[PDB]
Assembly symmetry: D2
Amino acid sequence: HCTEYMNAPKKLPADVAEELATTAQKLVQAGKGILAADESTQTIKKRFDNIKLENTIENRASYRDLLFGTKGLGKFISGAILFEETLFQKNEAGVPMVNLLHNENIIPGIKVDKGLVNIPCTDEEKSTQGLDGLAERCKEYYKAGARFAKWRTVLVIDTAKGKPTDLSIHETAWGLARYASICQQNRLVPIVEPEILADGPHSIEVCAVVTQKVLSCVFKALQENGVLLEGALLKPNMVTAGYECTAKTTTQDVGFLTVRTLRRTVPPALPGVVFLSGGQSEEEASVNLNSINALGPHPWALTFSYGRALQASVLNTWQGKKENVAKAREVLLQRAEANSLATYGKYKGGAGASLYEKK
Amino acid sequence: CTEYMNAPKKLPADVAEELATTAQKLVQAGKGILAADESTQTIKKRFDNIKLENTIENRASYRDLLFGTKGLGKFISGAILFEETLFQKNEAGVPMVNLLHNENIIPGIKVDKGLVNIPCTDEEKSTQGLDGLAERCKEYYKAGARFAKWRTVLVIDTAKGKPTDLSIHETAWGLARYASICQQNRLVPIVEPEILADGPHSIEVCAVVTQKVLSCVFKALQENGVLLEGALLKPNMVTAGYECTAKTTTQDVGFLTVRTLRRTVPPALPGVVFLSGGQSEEEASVNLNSINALGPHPWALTFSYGRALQASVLNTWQGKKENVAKAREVLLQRAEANSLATYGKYKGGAG
Amino acid sequence: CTEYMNAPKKLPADVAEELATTAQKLVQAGKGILAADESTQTIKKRFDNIKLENTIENRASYRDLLFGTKGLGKFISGAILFEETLFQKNEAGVPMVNLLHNENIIPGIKVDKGLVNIPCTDEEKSTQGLDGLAERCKEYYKAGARFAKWRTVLVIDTAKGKPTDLSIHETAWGLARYASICQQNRLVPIVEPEILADGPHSIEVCAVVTQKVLSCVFKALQENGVLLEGALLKPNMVTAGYECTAKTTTQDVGFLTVRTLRRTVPPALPGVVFLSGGQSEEEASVNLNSINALGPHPWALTFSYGRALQASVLNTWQGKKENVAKAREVLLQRAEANSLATYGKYKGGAG
Amino acid sequence: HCTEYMNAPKKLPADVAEELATTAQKLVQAGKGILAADESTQTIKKRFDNIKLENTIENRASYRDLLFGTKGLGKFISGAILFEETLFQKNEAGVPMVNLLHNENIIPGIKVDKGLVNIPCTDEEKSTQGLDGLAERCKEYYKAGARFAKWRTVLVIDTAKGKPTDLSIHETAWGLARYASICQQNRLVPIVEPEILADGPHSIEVCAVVTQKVLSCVFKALQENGVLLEGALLKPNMVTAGYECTAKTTTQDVGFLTVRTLRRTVPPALPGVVFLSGGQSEEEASVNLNSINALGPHPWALTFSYGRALQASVLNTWQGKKENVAKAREVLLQRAEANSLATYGKYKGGAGGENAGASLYEKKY
C-alpha cells in the first residue's frame, strides 16, 4: 500500500484500537474486577445439583437476575462474563438481563470458545476449539451488547511426562493468539486465559518455571498475530504449588512467585491481569490476591476474574428460593468487596501477634 | 518406558499401517487423483456454462457420469468427494462410493470449511475447519472415505512482502493440526498449501517462495507428529506469474518444481499430487510430463486434478444423458493422458 | 519437586543476587553510563579530528581525564572500558580502574569482537565474540569489571525488506548467548541491538521494526535462560530516518520510544540505557528528557553515551595538559544535563 | 533494483554453488567414503600411548604419510579430513602431505571447529565454538588445498533429565547452520555433524525419536541460514540403542531405524550422508553400514566418515616402526575396501546373514 516495513502485522484502525483500549482499562478499574457468570448448561446444572434444584431456563434466568440485579455491585465489579444464552436472556419480569448490568454500569462479556479436545500425539493434552465462525459470532455478540470475550485453554504440569509439552504450549499459545486477534478486529477485548492446572505434587518453583515458559510463549504468539496488548487482558493461574504437594507453602509465596513470573514475562502495555482462582476457596482466592497486591504498586492492574470464588456461598444461601435473594445478594456484595479490597492490598480477612506490657 | 517425553507420540501400529498403505495406493504407478469435491456454489458456476439448474439430481447424474466410467480406475487411484456426494445415491438408487469401489477407486473427502481473512494482514487467508473435525472424520470413515483434503491459499506479492510470516505459519500450523486429526481418525491427509500464481513474478521468485513455504509446512507437520508415510502433499507447480515475467517454458516449470521439492520434501512422503491451478487441461498434462521426464524421483510425482480432468467432460455432456457415453470418452482420454505424464511418456500429439 | 526439565536452569543464588544489584546500581536514580570503550581504530579517528597522535600515553591521559573527574560519580554509575584501558595505568602509574573506584563508579568492558557479514543477506551484520568469551569474562571480572557490552547492528531498508528474518534471529540469538555467558561468569550484560537510523523511513516504521526486533531479542533471552533482573537493554530510541523529510519533533520521539518499550520489555528488566546513535550531545539529552517527561516508567530509562558525553570534552581539550581542568568542567556539565534528563527535568522549554 | 522476494536467503554466486555441488558429489562417489584423519595433537597423544611411541611432529608426519601415501586408497576413499597442522605439513622427504592425496586423487578437508564448551543453564550440554575468524580461516584453508570442512557438535540422550533439551538442540542446530553458511561462501563443502552420543540405556526407538527431532531442527536451521543442501553433507550418528541397553540389538534394526529416520528428515537435494561410527568396533562400523545399504537403493549416498573405524588396526600393526609401514598399509586398504563394499550393501565379513545354519541333506531326485 504505502510501502513501509511489510513483514509485520498491520495496525488495527485508530477507532477500534481506541475503543478496545478504553474497555480494557475500564475492566481493570481501581478496586474492581470481573464476575465470571459464564457457566454452561452442563456446568450450571452441577451447581444446581448441590442445592437440590432443577436446571430449567427459568431457574437459570432467576439466578443470573439475582447476581446482575444486585444494587451497588458495580462498585466492585467492572464486567461480567456471560454464556451465550444469558446474553440474549430476560428475567421473569421481562427485562433484558444485560440491562441489569447496564444499570449497575457493568460491562457485559461473552465466553466464545467451543470447549476442549485432545491434541493427537500428546497424552491427552488439550486444544481449545472455537475459531470456526468466530468473527461472525463476535459481530453478533457486540450487537447484543458484549464488549469483551473469554477463551479458556488448559495446560497441565506433569514433570515425569514432560508435561506441558512443547506441542501443548504452542497449540495453546497459537489458538489464543488467533482468538485474540479475531476478537479485536470485531471490537471485543479478548481475555487470554492459558490456565496451567494445579493438579499434581509439584513445588511452587516448578509451577513458576512452567508458568513463565508458557507465558513467554503466549505473548510471543500474541505479537506474531498482531494483537494489541493495550486492548487485551490476561487471565493466568496464580503461581501455587500443586494440589497434592506435601510442602504446604503460604500466601506470601503465592504472592512473590506469582508477581515475579509476571514481571519477567508480561509487558506493561498490557493494562491488567485478571487472575483465575482454580480450585481455591472463596477466602483463599481473596487472601492470595491480597498477598499479590501487598507486593507492590504494579506496572499493571492485578485483579480478579472469579466465578466459583464469587458465587459459591451465594448459591448455598439461596437454594433457588425467591425469599433468599436478598440474603444471597448480601453475600455477593460481601465477597465482591472482599476482593475489591484485595485489589488494593488491604483485605485483612479476620509475628506482630503479641501479649503486651506496661510502662 | 523411559520415553523421551518432549516429542509428539507415535500413531498406534494398526492405524499407522493403514494410513501408509492408503497413501501408497493413492500414488500407485501410472495413477493419480480425481478432484470431484466441488461445493454447491463452485459447481453451480460450472453448470452456469452448460445451462442447467444446479439441482440435486443434476449433481448426482454428473458424479454418476464421472464415477461410473469403466476403466477409470486404471488411471485413477482415488476421488475427492464433497460431503453431499459421499452420502449420495445415483438415479438408480446406487451409492456413489459403490461406483468407486466397483471401479476400484478410493473415496476421499474435502474437510476444510473454507477461507477467512487473517486480521492484521492485507487480506491473506486462513483456512477454517478444525472445530468438530475429529468427529466428522469418524463419520466420513464410516461413510467409506479413506483420505481427506484441506486447502490453504498463499499469495505472491513481492512488493507487499506477501507470504508474510503470519500467513506462512497460520497456513503451516493449520495444515499440521488438520493432518494430525485426520491421521488419528484413520484418514490420509492431503496437505495443500496452494501458492497462487497471481501477479508478474518470475519463476525463480515462485521457487524461492514455494521453497520457504514448504520448509515451514513440513516443520509444522513434524511439530504436530504427522506421519509423512501416511500423508500426501498437494503443492502448486513452480511457474512464473500469470502476468508472464517473460513467458518461461515447460522445461523450466519441470526443473524449478523438481528442484524445490528435492530441497524441501523428505522421501518418507510417499508422493506429491500436484494441483493444476488455472492451467488448461493440456498444460496440466504437459507440465506434469516435464516434471517426470526428469527421471525416477524419490517420491511419486502425480496429480490431483479437478478442472484439468473435468473441463471437456462438462462440454461433451451438456446434462443430456445422450452424452453419458460421449462424456466418459473424454474422461478416460484425459485420465490416460495424465497417467502417461506420470510415467514421463506423454508427447500430447507430436510434442 | 522433581524439575520440569525442558527449561533453562537457574543461576546459583549468589551469582544471580550479585548481577541483580549491579544492574540496579547501573541504573541508579539520576545516573547513567559513560561509554569510554572506543577501540584504537575508532579513537584514532577522534584524536585525528583534534589533531593528536594516537599513542598509548595519549589514550591513557584522555581516559585519566575522563575517569579522574571529581564529582562524576554523582551522574555516572558505570563506565564501559576497552580491554587496554581496563589493564592500563596513567602517566602517574596508577590503575585507570582505581580512578573509577575512587568516584565509586562501576567498571565495565566491551566483549564483542566486532561485526562480519551474514552470508546470503545483503551485507547484514553478525556480531562475533563467543569464542573464548567465558574465559575472557573470568579475566575481566578479576581485573575489576562488573558488567559487559556487546553491540549488534540492524538496518532499516524497507524496499530491500531489511532487517530480514535471518538478520533478526542471528542478532537475537548471538545477544542471548553472549548475555548468558556473561551472567554465568558474573558480569551484567548490556544487550545492544542497535537498529541504525540510516534511510528515509518514518518514525512509525522504525517503531514497527524496533518492536519486532525487541520481541525477537527477548524471546531469545528466555530461550537461553537469561535473568532479566541481572541484565540491561541498550536499544536505539525510536526516531525517523536520517534522510527523511518531516521535521521530527522530540515529543514524537519520546512517545513512540516509550510505546515500543512498553509493548516489548518486561518490568523485571531493571533499566534501559539508550544509545544516542548519530544524535548531537544536546539532542541526546533533549530526547532522553522527552522520554522521561512521559512519566514514571516501570523501568529506569537512562543513558549509555560515548559521543554524546565526550564530543565537546575532546574539542575543548585539544590534547593539552592545561586544558584538562577545563575539559573536565565540560564533562560534568554534560553528565549533569543527562542526569536531569533522566528525571525529565532538563533545559528544553519550547512550549 | 528489481524486487524479488526479500524475506529469504540470497543464493550463492553461480560459480561457487557449482563448485560446492561437484565436490559434494565427489565426496560421496560410488563405492567411496571419507577418512577422518583430523585428530588433534591432544587426541593423537592418546593413540600413540597404546602403541608405546611418543608424540612428536616427526611421528605425526610419518603416520599421516603412512595413511595418505597408500597406493590405491583413492579407490575406496574420496576425501580425507585433516587437522590444521597436517594440511601445512611435509613428510621426512619434503613432500607436502596434501600432494600425497592429490596423486591418490583424494580430496583434502579440514576440521574447522574450535572444540566444545558448556551451555550455561543446561546440565553440561555442549556448544561448539569456532565462528570467530572462521571466514578468514576458510580462505586460508582453500588456498592450502582444502575443499571441504568439518564441524562437530555433540548432543546427549538422557530421558530422565529431558536431555537433549530444546536449548541444546537449537544452539547446536544454529551453530551448525552458521558454520555451514560461512564455509559455502568461502568455497568449502561443510560436513554438518550433529553427533547424538550413544551413552545411556535408552532403546533404539528413543534414539530414533531424538535423532529425528534433532535432524528436523538442524535442517530447519540450514534452510534459514540459506545453506545449499546440494553443496553440503550430513555426518549423523547411526540410530542405535544406548551403550548400557540390556545386551540386545541387531544390525538390521540399526539399519531400519537409521534409514527410516533419515527418510523422514533429510531432503534428497542433500547428495549424501557420511556416517560417524562412535564407539563401534571396526567390524561393527562396516556391518551396520552394510545393513543400512542392504535396504534398497537410497535417495542419497549413504556412506562413511570413519576415523577410529578405519585406523584402529592400522595403528596396531604399524607400532611406529618404518619396517611395518607396508604391513599397516595392508590393513588400511583392507578396511577401506570393507566399507566400500558396505556402501553397496555387499559386505560379508565372517557372518553374511540369517537363514538356517547348515547340516543340509542333498537327495538328488
